[PDB]
Amino acid sequence: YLVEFRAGKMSLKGTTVTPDKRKGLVYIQQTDDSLIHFCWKDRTSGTVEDDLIIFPDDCEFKRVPQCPSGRVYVLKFKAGSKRLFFWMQEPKTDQDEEHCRKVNECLNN
């Protein structure tokens, strides 16, 4: 994996963005066709539930500022305003911003 870190996901439940409680792993992998996949894996089951091919400039990964936990990040698509939300699961917050920087580097490089 190019980048990996502990994080939960969220889903739209009707109109409502709803955090998924499961322990998860976000990772980015380059496949042998040279494409870049942004993925989310359920740590308990091992199942990869999300696998998105991302090209440079498609996305920006960013902290969501108004969340009091400070742990919520969004993968925002520049075309269509599609958004995927994640919440950091490492117990200390020290590495959150570095994980975020590494995501943007891997996707845009």
Side-chain angles (χ1 to χ4, degrees):
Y1 301 156
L2 295 173
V3 179
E4 67 169 19
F5 55 92
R6 291 176 187 104
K9 67 177 272 185
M10 312 206 180
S11 69
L12 262 162
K13 177 180 174 189
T15 194
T16 304
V17 182
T18 304
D20 190 309
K21 292 169 172 173
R22 291 174 292 164
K23 296 174 180 177
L25 193 78
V26 169
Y27 65 89
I28 302 176
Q29 179 187 5
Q30 185 175 37
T31 40
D32 54 27
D33 58 7
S34 296
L35 300 178
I36 298 298
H37 296 69
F38 179 97
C39 301
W40 185 89
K41 182 185 175 166
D42 186 355
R43 286 177 59 194
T44 303
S45 69
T47 299
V48 179
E49 299 201 344
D50 301 295
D51 172 1
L52 297 194
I53 291 169
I54 308 294
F55 294 97
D57 286 357
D58 278 352
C59 294
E60 180 169 34
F61 194 65
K62 182 167 78 295
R63 195 177 72 89
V64 180
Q66 302 309 308
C67 297
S69 80
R71 307 312 293 284
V72 177
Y73 284 73
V74 59
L75 184 73
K76 179 183 191 312
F77 286 76
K78 301 190 181 200
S81 317
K82 179 185 162 118
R83 291 179 180 81
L84 292 185
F85 297 93
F86 300 88
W87 55 282
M88 301 289 189
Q89 285 172 339
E90 325 226 332
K92 296 195 200 174
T93 68
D94 301 46
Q95 285 183 41
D96 287 0
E97 276 290 287
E98 176 63 21
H99 290 321
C100 184
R101 265 183 303 268
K102 289 178 170 275
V103 168
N104 288 121
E105 288 171 343
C106 294
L107 295 180
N108 305 126
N109 277 241

